[model samples]
Structures are given as C-alpha cells and as structure tokens.
Target: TVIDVKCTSPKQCLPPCKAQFGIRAGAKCMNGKCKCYPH
Candidate 1:
C-alpha cells in the first residue's frame, strides 16, 4: 500500500477508486494535483 492509501484532503489524488471498482484502494496523485477514494 501507500503512505496515503486511505486518502483524503491532502491525502488525495485521482478520480475515486470506486469510480470503477467501488473500492477505496488508494489514489494516483500526479503529485499534489488531483485525488481519489471510495464514493
């Protein structure tokens, strides 16, 4: 997993893992840019 896997706020970066999987499997931050998580 990641240092910020269970992410939110500054803990973020992607469109939401659940957007496809309905899962909170961490995010893909372009380094302090976008964010993601469960719905």
Candidate 2:
C-alpha cells in the first residue's frame, strides 16, 4: 500500500532511498500529489 501525501512544496515530496531515515519507504511526486511507495 501507499500513503497519499499532499504536497505544496518540493520538500514535501519524500526522503532519500536505499535507506530509511525515519521513513520506511520512498516517495514520488505525481499529478500534484506526493505518493509514498512503501517497501
């Protein structure tokens, strides 16, 4: 499953990959929305 995070700024997108810095997954920007791709 994925978490839909609404973002207004670029920083709201997501965090780094290959590792989890408090974030258990990766996120991406799509159609003015931030989607958290859980691993």
Candidate 3:
C-alpha cells in the first residue's frame, strides 16, 4: 500500500500506515514518499 504524502522520516510515515492498515502495519520513507508494508 501507499500513502500519497511526503515523509522525511519513518516516525512520520508509520503512524498513517498503521492508522489506515492496522497496528501490525509498517511503513518507510522512500524518496520522500510514504511506502506502506504488506503490499
């Protein structure tokens, strides 16, 4: 999954991912974009 927003840090990325996907979800900042796990 993807979050269509810019992220400079995992701290910024993870919250949104977890919010959308669930507590077990994860995310990373990839070239300023939020890339979510379990894709």
Candidate 4:
C-alpha cells in the first residue's frame, strides 16, 4: 500500500529516516510533519 506523507518543511521531515520508515509502514502525514499511524 502507498502512503501520502505531507511535510510542511522538508528540512524537518525528510532528514529523519524514521519518518520515511513510518510512511513506508503505512502511515500518512497530517498538517505539517505529523505521521498518522494505522491503528
């Protein structure tokens, strides 16, 4: 499944590998740099 990760400032989101990992694991970004985890 593909996830949509939205980052307000790529500098704050793109640098972290964890953020990308979260998106890859079925998580979507909300607002600026918030990851929505599937529950």
Name the top TM-score candidate.
Answer: 3
Task: Name the Cα RMSD for model 3.
Answer: 1.9
Residues 1-39 of candidate 1: C-alpha lDDT, one tens digit per residue:
223434335344344454453465545554444344444
Which residue pairs does candidate 3 place in steric collision? none
What ranges in model 2 sit over 4 Å off?
Answer: 1-4, 8-10, 15-23
TM for every model, in the order presented, reads: 0.22, 0.42, 0.73, 0.24
Compare the candidates by lDDT and give the number of the best one.
3
| Candidate 4 C-alpha lDDT tens digits along 1-39 | 223445664334443434445443333345655454332
Output the lDDT of residue 38, model 3: 49
Q: Rank the candidates by lDDT, best first.
A: 3, 2, 1, 4
Scored against the true structure, residue 10 in model 1 reaches a CA lDDT of: 38
Task: Write down the TM-score for model 3.
Answer: 0.73
Which tens-of-lDDT digit does each residue in 1-39 have in candidate 2?
A: 334456674356465422443355666666777656556
> Which pairs in model 4 have colliding backbones?
none
Error of 3 at 30 (Å): 1.0
Cα lDDT for residue 27, candidate 1: 57
Residue 5 CA displacement from its true place in model 2, Å: 2.2
Clashes per candidate, residues 3 or more apart or on different chains: 5, 0, 0, 0
Name the better of 1 and 3 by lDDT: 3
Could you tell me which residue pairs clash in candidate 1?
13-34, 13-35, 14-35, 14-36, 18-22
Whole-model Cα lDDT of every candidate shown, in order: 0.43, 0.53, 0.79, 0.43
